[PDB]
Amino acid sequence: QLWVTVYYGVPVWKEATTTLFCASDARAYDTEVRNVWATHACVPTDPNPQEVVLENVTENFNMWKNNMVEQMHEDIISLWDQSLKPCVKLTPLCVTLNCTDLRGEIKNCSFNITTSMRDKVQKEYALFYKLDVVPIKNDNTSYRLISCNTSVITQACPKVSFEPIPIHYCAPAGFAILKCNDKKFNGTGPCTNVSTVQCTHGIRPVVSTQLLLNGSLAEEEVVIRSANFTDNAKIIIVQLNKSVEINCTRPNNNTRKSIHIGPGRWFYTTGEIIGDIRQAHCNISGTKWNDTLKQIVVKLKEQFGNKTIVFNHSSGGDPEIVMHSFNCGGEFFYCNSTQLFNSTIVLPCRIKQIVNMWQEVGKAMYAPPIKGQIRCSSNITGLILIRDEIFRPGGGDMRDNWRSELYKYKVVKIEPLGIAPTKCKRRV
Amino acid sequence: QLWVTVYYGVPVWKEATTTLFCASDARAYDTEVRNVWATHACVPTDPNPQEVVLENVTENFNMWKNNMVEQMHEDIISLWDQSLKPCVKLTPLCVTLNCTDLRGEIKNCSFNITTSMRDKVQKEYALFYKLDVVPIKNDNTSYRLISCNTSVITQACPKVSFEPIPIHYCAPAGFAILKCNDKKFNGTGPCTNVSTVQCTHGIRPVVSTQLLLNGSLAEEEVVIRSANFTDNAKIIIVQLNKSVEINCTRPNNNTRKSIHIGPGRWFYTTGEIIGDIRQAHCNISGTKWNDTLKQIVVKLKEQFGNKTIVFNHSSGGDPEIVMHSFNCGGEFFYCNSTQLFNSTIVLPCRIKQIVNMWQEVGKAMYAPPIKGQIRCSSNITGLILIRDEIFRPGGGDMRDNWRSELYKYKVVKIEPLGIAPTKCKRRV
Amino acid sequence: QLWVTVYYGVPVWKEATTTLFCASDARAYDTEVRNVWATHACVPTDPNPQEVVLENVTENFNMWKNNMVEQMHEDIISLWDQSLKPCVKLTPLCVTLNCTDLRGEIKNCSFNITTSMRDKVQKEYALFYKLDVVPIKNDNTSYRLISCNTSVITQACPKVSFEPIPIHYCAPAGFAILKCNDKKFNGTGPCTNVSTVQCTHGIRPVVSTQLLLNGSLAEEEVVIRSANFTDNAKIIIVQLNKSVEINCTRPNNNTRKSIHIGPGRWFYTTGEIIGDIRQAHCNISGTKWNDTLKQIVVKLKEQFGNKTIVFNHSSGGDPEIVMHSFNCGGEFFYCNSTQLFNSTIVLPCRIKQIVNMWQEVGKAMYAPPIKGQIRCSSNITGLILIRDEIFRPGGGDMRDNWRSELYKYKVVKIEPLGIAPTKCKRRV
Amino acid sequence: EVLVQSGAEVKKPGASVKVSCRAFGYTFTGNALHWVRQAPGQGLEWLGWINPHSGDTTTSQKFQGRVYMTRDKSINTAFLDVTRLTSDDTGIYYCARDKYYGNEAVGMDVWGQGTSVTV
Numbered sequence A, B, C: 001q002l003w004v005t006v007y008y009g010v011p012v013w014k015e016a017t018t019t020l021f022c023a024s025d026a027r028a029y030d031t032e033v034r035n036v037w038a039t040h041a042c043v044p045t046d047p048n049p050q051e052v053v054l055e056n057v058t059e060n061f062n063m064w065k066n067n068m069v070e071q072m073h074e075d076i077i078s079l080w081d082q083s084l085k086p087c088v089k090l091t092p093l094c095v096t097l098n099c100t101d102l103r104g105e106i107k108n109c110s111f112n113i114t115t116s117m118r119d120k121v122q123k124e125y126a127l128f129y130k131l132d133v134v135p136i137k138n139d140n141t142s143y144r145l146i147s148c149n150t151s152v153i154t155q156a157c158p159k160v161s162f163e164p165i166p167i168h169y170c171a172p173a174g175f176a177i178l179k180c181n182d183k184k185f186n187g188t189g190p191c192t193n194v195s196t197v198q199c200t201h202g203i204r205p206v207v208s209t210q211l212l213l214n215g216s217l218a219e220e221e222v223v224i225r226s227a228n229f230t231d232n233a234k235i236i237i238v239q240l241n242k243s244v245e246i247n248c249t250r251p252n253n254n255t256r257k258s259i260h261i262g263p264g265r266w267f268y269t270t271g272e273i274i275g276d277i278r279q280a281h282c283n284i285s286g287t288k289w290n291d292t293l294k295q296i297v298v299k300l301k302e303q304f305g306n307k308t309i310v311f312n313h314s315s316g317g318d319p320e321i322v323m324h325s326f327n328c329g330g331e332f333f334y335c336n337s338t339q340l341f342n343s344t345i346v347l348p349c350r351i352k353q354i355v356n357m358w359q360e361v362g363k364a365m366y367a368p369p370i371k372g373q374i375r376c377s378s379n380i381t382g383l384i385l386i387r388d389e390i391f392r393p394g395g396g397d398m399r400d401n402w403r404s405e406l407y408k409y410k411v412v413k414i415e416p417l418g419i420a421p422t423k424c425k426r427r428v
Numbered sequence D: 001e002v003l004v005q006s007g008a009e010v011k012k013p014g015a016s017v018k019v020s021c022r023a024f025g026y027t028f029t030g031n032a033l034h035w036v037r038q039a040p041g042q043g044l045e046w047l048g049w050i051n052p053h054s055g056d057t058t059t060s061q062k063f064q065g066r067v068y069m070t071r072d073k074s075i076n077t078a079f080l081d082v083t084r085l086t087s088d089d090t091g092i093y094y095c096a097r098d099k100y101y102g103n104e105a106v107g108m109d110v111w112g113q114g115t116s117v118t119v
């Protein structure tokens, strides 16, 4: 006769969803002076994080079911919006613009400011990008801001930063994160090299389109993951084993004017350019890009055919879909990126100040003018591809970019209490 | 010698006040798209709720001391107000109206819109109810909105619903709800048929004046409860055993115009009427009403006298007190309700768009125009009466209507730990 | 052989920081009708608080490291700001003023109100203080409010009170407050007469400059504490053993006008004066002041020299630094306070309505006009001194005034669990 | 830590007197109190002691049934209750505290001022 016995501390778990919390590096605590994501309201990371490799644990993973992506979706948007609450409405500035060309990507516009200094009116001028404003059809000399008839746009408070600090996300007590350490593992299915993680590595909240950058290189080969590689409704995520260097710049030493439009209220606008007008652009090593791209094809052809023609020029969607984009030095560049795919490298880039947190509903944020020149560089580490076997760059939203990193982990809940039959009866 | 022994799990309690939480049915979770009260931020009800009848438990109840009413008071008001936070201020629309009659309950008013589209002005027209606007004494052609000199009124966001979903309120662990199941129990005093409830049934957040509807019929007789039936300062709550059917309508296929009064800002207003002008009205079965009313008197006369003349026409207070009211299809009807009491049935009704959550301080909400016709029907289940032995309908606020349902329950706290003398001494 | 044994309930602690919570007296709960700090959202104090004197406990205290001061800093500011959230913006009232003298501390200004009652304009007049407004340089007849070109000022909601109610701060379970009861203890170092306190006495949130008042008299001698009495970068806090009586008044029976500047919006302004113009002033017993001051010198000379000349006239900073200030009856007085120090008493005082919570960034609050006359009196209990051996009154901020009381206490955390070697081995 | 006693009394033989002693500056219940008397021309006579926490007392054999001690912790006060007063009861009635290290008498360093009773 076997008897019921209770065992506590049983090493089992069930898959579960909970909230992960942030953990900061060291510096982020004191970056509150400007940085939105690198907040002071965040505990530190573990200076000596542990990891345990499990011997016989094999589990199913599915990156497209990874709920951590939703948490990152909401957190970035919420934090970004919170930081803009005290910022300046540009509503009264949309009233009028009399424009000529800058002495036409950039317009030199004069304007009439409505009662400002209590009982006074004033006139000013500023430089505007053609991507932020549009002409009046029956004038062709007068302009308005594009988003004015839908919603409010504010100018980010000058004391702001979006530096993409690699914040870590940690599980609460009672929970653990299991990591798939199988370098050849695709987006779904079983993984045998599994380890227990209490907290993940830091992930930079990088915002970009048509580019995976500044992290997560592949294990000495191009690694491609997709929900199917079959269905045209699905997309392909490409990891490179080597990064490709890109150097971007906006070589215009610009200044900015503070315009007061009433006592107690003001905003900044692009002022005069110190020096000549230089085109924003980015330098991509051609050989590295195309040598890598040849290697990408070597991996891609495994699913799509050995003589299959792949990788054509960007096409489809509006200019923010078609052009490649990033915040270089905080400045927003929209690059044609067709040279990279002009065969199945320096690109021109355009500048725009009205931006979305990936995509807003109605509202938008205005990027204050930046004094001086823009210089930055980065590591190209991957691609997202569009099915047509022609592939084109782009597609998806922030969750596809978050997923491209989060695919390594899943969350489980520890279930330590259970029973089993024994030969031992309770004594009384 | 008896010894002190501790007993834990003792089935006793003391009366206590705590916070009850909501519980949703099934659909409400996904009604967030419009519905204010039927939120997504609410756990489900128990699909198989339990109830325990107690054998020897008799307790005192007092519906006028039932604190659950205060919780409902505050929750409805708060949730209603929260839903209106992002909605449109109608402040600039109060500037002017040049009115004539609709081609005078409804006025056809033209108006001058102040600078709107940045540097433009415009003129528009719309239809208005006489209950929302008033004339200027020295013009008699010009009008203003009634509430303009006290506060801000906003137009409810079009994506809104106030459907009165029957949300349940549940007690937290450590607490229980005791229910009085005595069908003959009045508003106060002991009740012997008592049962333990963890969570109550759902109660619809019905807003009305001069009518208890869509639930809680009496046990085959008219049941009347009052704090006293004596003091003229108290009121009488009447439950019917059978409901009386009422069919209401506003047979005017109306449309609405979206008026933009600046880029990024707009509101809806009543547009043209498709078809002729029909009067809003409600059809009450006369025989059912009066047959029931005769029965109401049969119960009422027990306290007030066998030959006593009761139930006269509505009188006292302003039009929202004197007229009967409800949101038919979401539209606000104010009905004379004098025919029902024209002896000690189809009523005309008036329409008003500025409304309160029972009664606001200063501020108010504006009910956006409703496209199409209004049709609804309902179950009359009870009355609230005013002392003069003439009785008249009306009186009270949301708490009297909430109390009329909540009277069945009280909250207690479980107190499981206690001691008693035993013959057994502790051994060491 | 000694064995490890666990002992729980060990009477030890370590210094620790936690959050203290408020506790109300009795009346404050129902002062919510006006009073900001004396809120309803606060539990009561212990009607019978306990204190335990410890026999052999000596600990180091440091008033300049007392973190309770930061909690009071933040709490007062936050609560004050919360109370002003629904109040009236005075932004449109800054547009114009045509001023002459009152029939020039007080100006009689007329003004043009911009479109107010929808399509109407109006003209009004009001009385203004020279400390709130400034002239236009090229007019010398026209005025503007001083803070208009930096930020928004609101008029406190009429239903407001800042009565400095002595709210107590209590430690949470697991924590305790240790008090230094050594009457001769300076601001830092060991204290042997130490007692355990669960909750402190009440401290009034008094706002003043150049004066410690209405509490905490010294133990029959002047008691002076300083971080150093050496370094000119440090300040001196002086406690008196006897208070000095001060009687303040603004003997002008003023009225106020409610000015509506649009339907739904209005503010109060100083109206006509009933009677003549009397100067605001304060009566300080001269003999008590100077007799005390002689005694202050007796204590001060211990550190600074027996024939050293001390205590000269106020000097340094802008008028809110140089003049003494308080809210008499809620009215803001700025007194010269030079007579008190005219030798190494009735002072004139000026009135100002724009105020800060000690010091705001950009924004400010406007004190609504007060109907009737101002009368109050108070207990002078101490001084803050500025090094030059001439001393002058003033310096510091709210934390110096909070610290001047909080110096008596420090917070510790109880650590009851520990181990020790025993002669007893565990039996199995 | 001080001990504060009530005032003086005048009684006739056969009467009774009650002398209080307040625990100022220390926990009332944290230190047992002694009562000592000194009649004119006399040395120090012990009457007894009371535990302010438990109410436990010990008295001199001389006063069994005559000298009682009580306490009320709500006011931090101990009391000496003396009956059957006679002329030998004229004297100063003092309250005092010991160290009670190890819960045993050591010697008393804290004394009240003493009150007089005339009989």
Ligand SMILES: *[C@@H]1O[C@H](CO)[C@@H](O[C@@H]2O[C@H](CO)[C@@H](O[C@@H]3O[C@H](CO[C@H]4O[C@H](CO)[C@@H](O)[C@H](O)[C@@H]4O)[C@@H](O)[C@H](O[C@H]4O[C@H](CO)[C@@H](O)[C@H](O)[C@@H]4O)[C@@H]3O)[C@H](O)[C@H]2NC(C)=O)[C@H](O)[C@H]1NC(C)=O
Binding pocket: A034, A163, A164, A204, A206, A207, A213, A214, A329, A375, A376, A377, A378, A379
């Ligand atoms: C991929 O990774 C690359 C780098 O590996 C990132 O690009 C760099 O990002 C950092 C952070 O945003 C940039 O840092 C900026 O450098 C400017 C110049 O630095 C020089 O001068 C300063 C003067 O004191 C020296 O301290 C410093 O050592 C250098 O000598 C600074 O001026 C910038 O400061 C900004 O913020 C302060 C805050 O108040 C302002 O006052 C400044 O005016 C200014 O706004 C800042 O420190 C760096 O320049 C970037 N480029 C390069 C080539 O490294 C990519 O952004 C990253 N991409 C993604 C998507 O992650």
Ligand SMILES: *[C@@H]1O[C@H](CO)[C@@H](O[C@@H]2O[C@H](CO)[C@@H](O[C@@H]3O[C@H](CO[C@H]4O[C@H](CO)[C@@H](O)[C@H](O)[C@@H]4O)[C@@H](O)[C@H](O[C@H]4O[C@H](CO)[C@@H](O)[C@H](O)[C@@H]4O)[C@@H]3O)[C@H](O)[C@H]2NC(C)=O)[C@H](O)[C@H]1NC(C)=O
Binding pocket: B034, B163, B164, B204, B206, B207, B213, B214, B329, B375, B376, B377, B378, B379
């Ligand atoms: C007392 O109880 C009665 C019923 O017992 C309540 O009255 C009914 O309340 C419901 C809910 O408010 C009303 O439902 C409305 O019905 C309209 C018409 O329904 C027909 O057409 C639709 C078209 O798809 C069919 O699906 C449906 O089966 C019917 O054929 C709908 O148009 C209404 O929808 C509204 O919301 C949506 C949300 O986006 C909008 O798009 C619509 O334009 C519209 O605004 C809604 O579904 C019902 O008509 C009411 N009347 C009757 C006679 O049943 C009383 O209100 C209740 N009173 C109290 C106080 O509790």
Ligand SMILES: *[C@@H]1O[C@H](CO)[C@@H](O[C@@H]2O[C@H](CO)[C@@H](O[C@@H]3O[C@H](CO[C@H]4O[C@H](CO)[C@@H](O)[C@H](O)[C@@H]4O)[C@@H](O)[C@H](O[C@H]4O[C@H](CO)[C@@H](O)[C@H](O)[C@@H]4O)[C@@H]3O)[C@H](O)[C@H]2NC(C)=O)[C@H](O)[C@H]1NC(C)=O
Binding pocket: C034, C163, C164, C204, C206, C207, C213, C214, C329, C375, C376, C377, C378, C379
């Ligand atoms: C240092 O300590 C002194 C006192 O020791 C403080 O000065 C006093 O502070 C209190 C509280 O602020 C003042 O109280 C005010 O008294 C006015 C007159 O009182 C008489 O008339 C009323 C009429 O009913 C009688 O009830 C009362 O017994 C007296 O006969 C009141 O009118 C004031 O009320 C205010 O608030 C109400 C709320 O709605 C308004 O309606 C009123 O209009 C008014 O605004 C208030 O009660 C007292 O007058 C002060 N002076 C004196 C001499 O005591 C110091 O402020 C304090 N200083 C510091 C820094 O702590």
Ligand SMILES: *[C@@H]1O[C@H](CO)[C@@H](O[C@@H]2O[C@H](CO)[C@@H](O[C@@H]3O[C@H](CO[C@H]4O[C@H](CO)[C@@H](O)[C@H](O)[C@@H]4O)[C@@H](O)[C@H](O)[C@@H]3O)[C@H](O)[C@H]2NC(C)=O)[C@H](O)[C@H]1NC(C)=O
Binding pocket: C053, C181, C182, C193, D001, D002, D023, D024, D025, D026
């Ligand atoms: C550690 O701090 C403790 C707390 O302050 C110290 O205890 C204090 O010790 C002093 C010593 O002189 C006592 O002062 C005396 O108090 C009596 C009280 O009687 C009067 O007041 C009461 C109040 O109701 C009234 O009822 C009476 O009729 C009297 O009017 C005075 O009479 C004396 O003159 C003198 O002031 C303190 O009272 C006492 N504090 C408490 C709370 O009892 C302790 O000594 C300190 N220890 C060290 C080592 O410094």
Ligand SMILES: *[C@@H]1O[C@H](CO)[C@@H](O[C@@H]2O[C@H](CO)[C@@H](O[C@@H]3O[C@H](CO)[C@@H](O)[C@H](O)[C@@H]3O)[C@H](O)[C@H]2NC(C)=O)[C@H](O)[C@H]1NC(C)=O
Binding pocket: A214, A215, A243, A378, A379
């Ligand atoms: C983009 O690519 C460049 C080039 O590979 C990356 O720069 C490299 O970053 C690593 C970071 O560890 C540097 O390593 C250094 O090693 C020395 C060895 O003692 C150590 O002391 C340093 O603290 C550091 O670890 C490496 O030198 C550096 N390479 C160059 C040429 O500077 C860059 O980090 C990549 N960017 C991103 C975002 O991945």
Ligand SMILES: *[C@@H]1O[C@H](CO)[C@@H](O[C@@H]2O[C@H](CO)[C@@H](O[C@@H]3O[C@H](CO)[C@@H](O)[C@H](O)[C@@H]3O)[C@H](O)[C@H]2NC(C)=O)[C@H](O)[C@H]1NC(C)=O
Binding pocket: B214, B215, B243, B378, B379
């Ligand atoms: C207003 O009064 C009408 C008339 O009494 C109420 O309509 C009735 O509602 C009940 C709800 O249970 C219907 O019962 C039905 O019984 C069948 C039996 O198999 C069941 O399958 C259905 O699911 C449902 O339970 C009843 O038929 C229905 N009467 C009519 C004539 O349709 C109405 O609910 C009352 N409204 C309120 C708010 O109380």
Ligand SMILES: *[C@@H]1O[C@H](CO)[C@@H](O[C@@H]2O[C@H](CO)[C@@H](O[C@@H]3O[C@H](CO)[C@@H](O)[C@H](O)[C@@H]3O)[C@H](O)[C@H]2NC(C)=O)[C@H](O)[C@H]1NC(C)=O
Binding pocket: C214, C215, C243, C378, C379
């Ligand atoms: C400013 O100084 C004056 C004068 O010393 C303070 O007034 C005094 O306040 C105390 C408060 O306890 C009054 O004590 C009273 O004693 C009687 C005795 O039976 C008691 O019944 C009362 O309830 C109260 O405790 C004292 O009489 C009073 N002095 C005068 C002349 O009225 C005043 O409180 C000081 N203000 C501040 C803020 O410290």
Ligand SMILES: *[C@@H]1O[C@H](CO)[C@@H](O[C@@H]2O[C@H](CO)[C@@H](O)[C@H](O)[C@H]2NC(C)=O)[C@H](O)[C@H]1NC(C)=O
Binding pocket: A146, A147, A148, A149, A150, A151
């Ligand atoms: C503001 O109004 C203008 C037109 O008055 C809108 O312009 C339209 O933009 C869409 C974008 O694809 C074009 O397809 C339409 O043809 C444009 N209209 C005209 C008349 O050319 C503009 O989009 C509106 N702004 C916002 C933010 O919605």
Ligand SMILES: *[C@@H]1O[C@H](CO)[C@@H](O[C@@H]2O[C@H](CO)[C@@H](O)[C@H](O)[C@H]2NC(C)=O)[C@H](O)[C@H]1NC(C)=O
Binding pocket: A227, A228, A230, A231, A232, A234
């Ligand atoms: C991956 O591709 C397969 C290919 O068959 C998908 O299968 C679909 O099956 C349904 C069943 O009737 C067909 O109607 C579809 O046309 C098939 N899709 C295709 C692309 O042919 C499967 O659903 C795909 N899985 C994912 C994740 O997309």
Ligand SMILES: *[C@@H]1O[C@H](CO)[C@@H](O[C@@H]2O[C@H](CO)[C@@H](O)[C@H](O)[C@H]2NC(C)=O)[C@H](O)[C@H]1NC(C)=O
Binding pocket: B146, B147, B148, B149, B150, B151
């Ligand atoms: C706006 O002002 C008008 C008058 O200028 C107010 O009208 C009064 O309304 C009350 C309501 O019972 C009447 O008794 C008064 O006689 C009306 N005044 C006049 C002159 O007829 C109106 O109430 C004000 N609006 C608000 C919202 O308070």
Ligand SMILES: *[C@@H]1O[C@H](CO)[C@@H](O[C@@H]2O[C@H](CO)[C@@H](O)[C@H](O)[C@H]2NC(C)=O)[C@H](O)[C@H]1NC(C)=O
Binding pocket: B227, B228, B230, B231, B232, B234
């Ligand atoms: C119910 O009615 C009784 C009737 O007597 C109320 O009694 C009141 O008693 C006071 C005592 O002096 C009288 O002054 C009142 O006039 C009485 N009221 C009436 C209506 O006569 C009792 O208070 C009432 N209870 C409730 C709940 O109203």
Ligand SMILES: *[C@@H]1O[C@H](CO)[C@@H](O[C@@H]2O[C@H](CO)[C@@H](O)[C@H](O)[C@H]2NC(C)=O)[C@H](O)[C@H]1NC(C)=O
Binding pocket: C146, C147, C148, C149, C150, C151
């Ligand atoms: C609003 O503008 C005026 C000047 O246009 C500012 O006045 C200055 O105030 C500072 C204060 O110390 C003086 O030193 C300057 O000399 C003043 N300027 C002039 C021209 O006299 C005023 O401070 C501004 N208001 C705010 C709130 O900043």
Ligand SMILES: *[C@@H]1O[C@H](CO)[C@@H](O[C@@H]2O[C@H](CO)[C@@H](O)[C@H](O)[C@H]2NC(C)=O)[C@H](O)[C@H]1NC(C)=O
Binding pocket: C227, C228, C230, C231, C232, C234
């Ligand atoms: C209190 O005064 C002493 C006096 O010496 C301060 O000592 C300082 O020591 C540094 C060391 O090089 C000197 O450079 C400073 O000049 C000294 N200060 C003075 C005023 O002479 C000590 O730091 C002071 N402590 C506090 C709390 O201020």
Ligand SMILES: *[C@@H]1O[C@H](CO)[C@@H](O)[C@H](O)[C@H]1NC(C)=O
Binding pocket: A098, A099, A141, A142
């Ligand atoms: C724009 O500038 C031209 C320059 O001559 C002027 O004629 C025209 O009226 C201006 N338009 C506005 C709107 O100011």
Ligand SMILES: *[C@@H]1O[C@H](CO)[C@@H](O)[C@H](O)[C@H]1NC(C)=O
Binding pocket: A186, A187, A188, A189, A226, A227, A228
């Ligand atoms: C991953 O590889 C396994 C190998 O059997 C396959 O079954 C699974 O469908 C693959 N999933 C994806 C998304 O490629």
Ligand SMILES: *[C@@H]1O[C@H](CO)[C@@H](O)[C@H](O)[C@H]1NC(C)=O
Binding pocket: A245, A246, A247, A283, A284, A285, A377
């Ligand atoms: C970017 O600039 C650095 C500067 O040393 C250079 O080494 C690197 O090769 C440049 N990258 C490209 C793509 O030109």
